[PDB]
Structure formats: C-alpha cells, structure tokens
Amino acid sequence: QVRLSQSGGQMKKPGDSMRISCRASGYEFINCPINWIRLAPGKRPEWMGWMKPRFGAVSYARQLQGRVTMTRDMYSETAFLELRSLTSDDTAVYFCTRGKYCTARDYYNWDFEHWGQGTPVTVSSASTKGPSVFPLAPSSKSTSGGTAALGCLVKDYFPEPVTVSWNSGALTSGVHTFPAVLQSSGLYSLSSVVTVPSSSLGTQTYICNVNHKPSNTKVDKKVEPKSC
C-alpha cells in the first residue's frame, strides 16, 4: 500500500531556509514522479514542482525559480524539499503528492491520489506590536426605546491573537468579536461590537478589555457617545 510520510512541522523567521523530507513506500520508487504542493488558508493550492527519482530530474514552478531545490535519496526512497529566503507568503502546509496511475511503463502525474500527512511551516518575524484601540461611537440616532450598537476597533497588531471582553467579562449578551483580518501592512486588526439598550448609554459604563499576550499588552478603552 502506497504511503508518503513527511517530516515534522517547524517555525522559521524571514530570511531563513526550510528543508522537509518525504519518505515513500509501497511501490517502485523510480516509476512515478513526486510533486510538492503547498496549501495556505484562503489562497489556492500552489504546485511547487515535481521530481523524477530516476536521475533526480526536476521541474520547478516559474514563480519559485531560484529559491526551491528538490532532491532524493535512492537507498531510503526519500524525496527532499528546500525553500530558501522565506517570507510571510511562504507560511503554509506543505504536501508531497504522487499520481494515482503509476506503472513501470506509464504514469499520469496530476491525479493526486496519494498525499503526505502534511508539514505545517510558519514563517513570521519575532517582533511584536501592541494594538491600537479606537472606540466605536454608537451614533446619535436609532430610536428612543430600541437598540443601539457600540464597540472598539483593535487595529494594527502583530501577531495573532487578541481577545476582547466587555466590562471585565460582566457583559456577554449581544457581544460579537469578529475574526481578525490581515491588512496590506502585514498587521492584523479586528472589531468587537455589542448591542445595548439605548436608554442605558447615559447610565451604564461600557469598557472593552483588549488583551494581546505576545506583546504583554492589556488596554482598557471606555466607549462613550461623542458630545457635540
């Protein structure tokens, strides 16, 4: 039975190089080529290249040309991947694959029936940046005996995650803390809102508690309606 065993996950910094292995078994190793596919959440799976064990023939994807090297050991029947000069865009789960149809006379490479268990690779700076917390003013409308909405914007922090509570956790009803998004600057940001009775805005105090463990940052921001 065809098996592909990959090496363990690892963490890297921008500028480093990674190397992962893929030990194959259960078939004639030199009969079929081995591919390397990386999958990052949100982005389409990216084919990095294939390697044919016979003479170690390789074919790298154009966009990775110069940074990637694929080799193999014939004795241990293990394929190897190397990616140099890593950046945040290299953060992904790396797979070795092999085609379904593989005989001694013919093969079709691209029908990936066989996948390795995957090798998670995280590439991020060791630097940490505390979040900026801006209040979200509930505006001066929305009925008199209805519901309003307030919150605080947690912007420009790195890395994940941040957690938000309200009134030291006393306020949980109607709270929505949205999943963070990755901005173009490479910094994260999210919003935490809460819906409260409009008649309480002049009586009850609402404070969002933002926590950012990597930067050792705990900031409390009081969200009050603007006076004009």
Binding site: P45, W47, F95, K100, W115, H176, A180, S189, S191, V193
Partner: protein, 208 residues
C-alpha cells in the same frame, strides 16, 4: 485559468452541494476534498470518474468549459473545502460549511465614523456592522460621495451563533486622513434577503 465558484457554501445535512469550475483549456479535471486538519483527498478525476472509497453521492459533470461537482445528501464527512484541478493549476476553492436552518432574519445595519483619536494618526477607518441576520449570503458595498468603492475594504464574518442561528458581518473601509477629509458622504449599502430593498446607513463628515 481555473475559476471556481462559489467561494462559500453554507448548507444543511441532507441537502446538495453544487460546486462549479470553469477552465480556459480542456483537459483532465480533478476534484479534491480537504477535511479540517487533514490532507486533501482525491474525489473525482478525469471529469466524472469516481475515486476509490467515494460514494455515488459525489457526481461529476461537464457542460462546455464548466465542470460541476454535485454532492447529494450531505453528511458530516462531506463538509470541508473543495478544489478543482487541471495539471498544476488549482481553483480558489469552495468552502462547504454546516448551516443550521432558521427563519429569514434581516440585519441591523450600523455605521461607525472614524474616531478623533485615530484621525491623529493619519489614517481613518469607517466600520459598517451587519448584526444578527440569516441566511449568511449578504453583500456590502461602500459609497463615498455616491461613488462605488473597491479594494479599500475588508470583511469579517462570525460563525453561526449557537443560540439564534444568525450571522454577523463587519466591513471596514480604510482611507488616509488626507483622502478622508476630501469627501463628505460616507455610506455602506446592505443587500439581504430579509430586506425588501437595499438598506443604506450613512453620515456626513463634520456634522453630528
């Protein structure tokens, strides 16, 4: 070359998932399934040929350049993200997630001007809130002085609430302090099934 649609598919167990893929070149097209925290699995290859272990609930079809993966009677294991593939090319992927059904609920739309504290920095963030709606399918378009905005906003959607089975969405429009003070009217247009017509919440810069 490979255009896969839709991006997200929120369905209930027992329903059918319809995932399409348009190609710019004819050739052997495959379908893959990736369960959460697992390696991708070959489901269909060569257009409609079923892989080993795949139930007949998965069916492949092709009309012109359009390849469709239909998954009848959804089960727990069927959910995840699906990809189409031709040679070394892959589609963007379709996310098939579990949706618990309920009555149609319209979103409560709120808009938030950038704080005076943030304006000191040099950038301004306008936040539009879509609260407690169903189904998930909702569209948000930003308008600045009645002009369609594009490329300067990011959306975030919460998971389906365990209590009321609703969704909430957050859209953030980012502009520089200089570019923000150039315009007056800022608005987000919300279109949803629970609304007879698109709802717009807006404010004018400066006034209260």
């Amino acid at each position: 070359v490979l255009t896969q649609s839709p991006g997200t598919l929120s369905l209930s167990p027992g329903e059918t998932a319809i995932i399409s893929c348009r190609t710019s070149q004819y050739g052997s097209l495959a379908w893959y399934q990736q369960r959460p925290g697992q390696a991708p699995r070959l489901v269909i290859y060569s257009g409609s040929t079923r892989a080993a272990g795949i139930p007949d609930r998965f069916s492949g079809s092709r009309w012109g350049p359009d390849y469709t993966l239909t998954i009848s009677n959804l089960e727990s294991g069927d959910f995840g993200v699906y990809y189409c593939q031709q040679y070394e090319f892959f589609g963007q992927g379709t996310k098939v997630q579990v949706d618990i059904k309920r009555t149609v609920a319209a979103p409560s739309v709120f808009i938030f001007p950038p704080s005076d504290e943030q304006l000191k920095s040099g950038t301004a963030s306008v936040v539009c809130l879509l609260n407690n709606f169903y189904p998930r399918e909702a569209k948000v378009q930003w308008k600045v002085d009645n002009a369609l905005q594009s490329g300067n906003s990011q959306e975030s959607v919460t998971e389906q609430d365990s209590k009321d089975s609703t969704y909430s969405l957050s859209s953030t429009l980012t502009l520089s302090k200089a570019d923000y003070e150039k315009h007056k009217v800022y608005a987000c247009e919300v279109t949803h099934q629970g609304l007879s017509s698109p709802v717009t919440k807006s404010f004018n810069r400066g006034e209260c």
